[PDB]
Ligand binder design. Structure first.
Ligand SMILES: *[C@@H]1O[C@H](CO)[C@@H](O)[C@H](O)[C@H]1NC(C)=O
Ligand SMILES: NC(=[NH2+])NCCC[C@@H](N)C(=O)O
Ligand code: NA
Ligand code: NA
Lengths: 28, 10, 251
């Protein structure tokens, strides 16, 4: 869908979940 | 498991 | 999920529970990819060695859940299946090659704070992110240990493993339609999917567009969280032409 993968309670509100940064830090 | 509404099992 | 943690509310709004009607029990995980389509592992629906061959009316899909066992009134939504589609070259005889299936819902599900679809990868997102060391996220209501069961949805982040290491960890023949993920013994950290997590999603958050993509489907393992073993995942992008053909022909 057009807004696939954007979570209402996180990305849509610019709130981060407690461990997504661990994923980002691995994308070197 | 808690029983689900019967509407979904019919 | 072994060595994971409780999910946050709305953390995985594409999570789907495959639920048997009678007896009422969890069968597998799955994921929401549109308002009418759910993705899962073929072995969740068809595995003749275990006399498993479910039909549409055997099953329900529960979407928007957090608690494993509770009926989450006003939050979860329960959908009936219109049709199951299993990959025509799913190899249940040998190694679970092409372990993928789609389920079309009888009616569209309403999106909410708790119900929202995941993206499927394009070629470029797959090439950029499916690299050894890059971490994805696995979620499910499966067992907490190989040898018990969680109150709420569990989550674990795990690194993709180099293909030679995947191959050298098992006697099973690995194919390009699979990848493996998990920590190595020397890495200290732990975690794996386990019984009941099958069919659920392995997701990655693209750093290019900040969207979550489903790269894998929980497919198979040897035990759970064993040192020197890795979880194996269906390679979603490599099977996407089949996904698209099904949705275009039947959607
Ligand atoms: C699974 O069951 C369906 C319906 O009974 C049948 O048509 C199909 O041949 C079965 N598949 C296998 C591999 O046995
Ligand atoms: N990654 C891992 N150790 N196992 C994945 C497959 C779980 C499957 N046996 C099931 O759900 O029964
Ligand atoms: Na091997
Ligand atoms: Na392991």
């Amino acid at each position: 869908e057009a807004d696939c993968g954007l979570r209402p309670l996180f990305e849509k509100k610019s709130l981060e979940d407690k461990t997504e940064r661990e994923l980002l830090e691995s994308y070197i | 498991f808690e029983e689900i509404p019967e509407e979904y099992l019919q | 999920i072994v060595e994971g943690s409780d999910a946050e509310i709305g953390m995985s709004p594409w999570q789907v529970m495959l639920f048997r009607k009678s007896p009422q029990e969890l069968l597998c995980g799955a994921s929401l990819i549109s308002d009418r389509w759910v993705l899962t592992a073929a072995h969740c629906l068809l595995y003749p060695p275990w006399d498993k061959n479910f039909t549409e009316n055997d099953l329900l899909v529960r979407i928007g859940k957090h608690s494993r066992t509770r009926y989450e009134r006003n939050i979860e939504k329960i959908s009936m299946l219109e049709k199951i589609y299993i990959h025509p070259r799913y190899n249940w005889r040998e190694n679970l090659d092409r372990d993928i299936a789609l389920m079309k819902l009888k009616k569209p599900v309403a999106f909410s704070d708790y119900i929202h679809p995941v993206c499927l990868p394009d070629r470029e997102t797959a090439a950029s992110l499916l690299q050894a060391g890059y971490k994805g996220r696995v979620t499910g209501w499966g067992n907490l240990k190989e040898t018990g069961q969680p109150s709420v949805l569990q989550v674990v982040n795990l690194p993709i493993v180099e293909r030679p290491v995947c191959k050298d960890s098992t006697r099973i023949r690995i194919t390009d339609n699979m990848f493996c993920a998990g920590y190595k013994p020397d890495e200290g950290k732990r975690g794996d999917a386990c019984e009941g997590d099958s069919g659920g999603p392995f997701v990655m958050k693209s750093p290019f567009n900040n969207r979550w993509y489903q790269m894998g489907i929980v497919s198979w393992g040897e035990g759970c969280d064993r040192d020197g073993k890795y979880g194996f995942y269906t390679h979603v992008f490599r099977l996407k032409k089949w996904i698209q053909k099904v949705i275009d022909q039947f959607g």
